[PDB]
Amino acid sequence: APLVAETDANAKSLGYVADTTKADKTKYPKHTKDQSCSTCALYQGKTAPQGACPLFAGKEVVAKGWCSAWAKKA
Amino acid sequence: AAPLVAETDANAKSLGYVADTTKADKTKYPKHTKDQSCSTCALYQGKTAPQGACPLFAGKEVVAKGWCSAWAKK
Amino acid sequence: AAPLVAETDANAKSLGYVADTTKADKTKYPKHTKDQSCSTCALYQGKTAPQGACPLFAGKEVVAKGWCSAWAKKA
Ligand code: SF4
Ligand code: SF4
Ligand code: SF4
Fold this sequence. Notes:
Three copies of one chain form a homotrimer.
Chain A: H1 9-14, E1 50-51, E2 61-62
Antiparallel strand pairs in A: 1-2
Bound molecules: iron/sulfur cluster (3 copies).
């Protein structure tokens, strides 16, 4: 799978959104639309549009999504 | 994604870690069975994700369908 | 207390982890600032301690003064 919901408590704590274009720039001014789970060093889905994230147990995140822990790759 | 244990890593080689439990070395480890995997191990911290931490291998993650000779039923 | 993360650990290198945020690779991570550290990260579990756990680094502890690319501003 099931997909993380934006109302889930853990999602709220990190500002997770299923669409990076809807991220809350008032809390996270350094967010860009170039940041998404697809380009995050923690995403486990490779080129797939959905996949696992270590911060979100028993759920999958969408590649076009984002959270405040978005981690630029090395 | 977080880096995975390499089967050629020294601790991996010694313990017989394999990324898929179906490829475990039964000659060295006759107590292995294909129902044993990181996913059913007491030490695996990945929950339902395809990869997750194992404290023994701290620094690199293990694959949920993998196995090593330190496997212990949860 | 557990062993501290080493900057050469594979998971640390993947996240650009440094034990001191003032040594972060600002060329690779241009949005880093020294206001970002584990002590100000939503993921840090050590509270006011100088070292403590982080969910991204199993079996170890991170330095509170440290930083990695997953630094998460608190909600
Ligand atoms: S940590 Fe990375 S993969 Fe996980 S939801 Fe946040 S941006 Fe997506
Ligand atoms: S101790 Fe358990 S979780 Fe760790 S690699 Fe071995 S079988 Fe997998
Ligand atoms: S996720 Fe946060 S607490 Fe963990 S190493 Fe990175 S900056 Fe430090």
